[PDB]
Amino acid sequence: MHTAEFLETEPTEISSVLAGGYNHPLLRQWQSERQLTKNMLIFPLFISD
Amino acid sequence: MHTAEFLETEPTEISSVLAGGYNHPLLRQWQSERQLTKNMLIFPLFISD
């Protein structure tokens, strides 16, 4: 009978662990190199004669 | 009589002109690599027993 196979793993390498930096909603913001603000927007205007 | 002296100047070099990038209040913001937001603040708390 086909059964789930689990390979022999080695101890986790710290260099592999990145999850600690984006496990929370706030972290999603901290992880952004730049946050979206109102004064960053430029609305186009088509003026007619 | 001591009078104001003005030296002979050469035509302005474009590479000298940087003023066009921060002459307006909004430009002061555009010139910032990162803007200050509320979710960037971390308030310290001293809990007593």
B35 by Cβ neighbours in 10 Å (0-12 / 13-18 / 19+) ranks as: middle
Alpha helices in chain A (DSSP H): 25-30
Q: DSSP E strands: which ranges in chain A?
A: none
CA distance B35 to A29: 13
Structure tokens at B27: 């430009």
Give which of A40, A21, A37 is closest to B39, Cα–Cα. A37
Judge whether B32 is closer than 8 Å to chain A, CB to CB.
no
**Contact between residue B39 and residue A29 where contact means Cβ atoms under 8 Å apart:** yes
Residues of chain B neighbouring A34 (CB-CB closer than 8 A): 34
Cβ distance A26 to B37 less than 8 Å, yes or no, reads: no
CA distance A4 to A36: 46
CA distance A30 to B40: 7
Resolution for this model in angstroms, one decimal place? 1.9
Choose from A32, A35, A42 for mutation: most chain B CBs within 10 A.
Answer: A35
CA distance A35 to B39: 10
The alpha-carbon gap from B17 to the nearest alpha carbon of chain A, in Å, equals 24
**Contact between residue B21 and residue B31 where contact means Cβ atoms under 8 Å apart:** yes
A35 Cβ contact partners less than 8 Å away, ≥ 6 residues apart = A29, B35, B37, B39
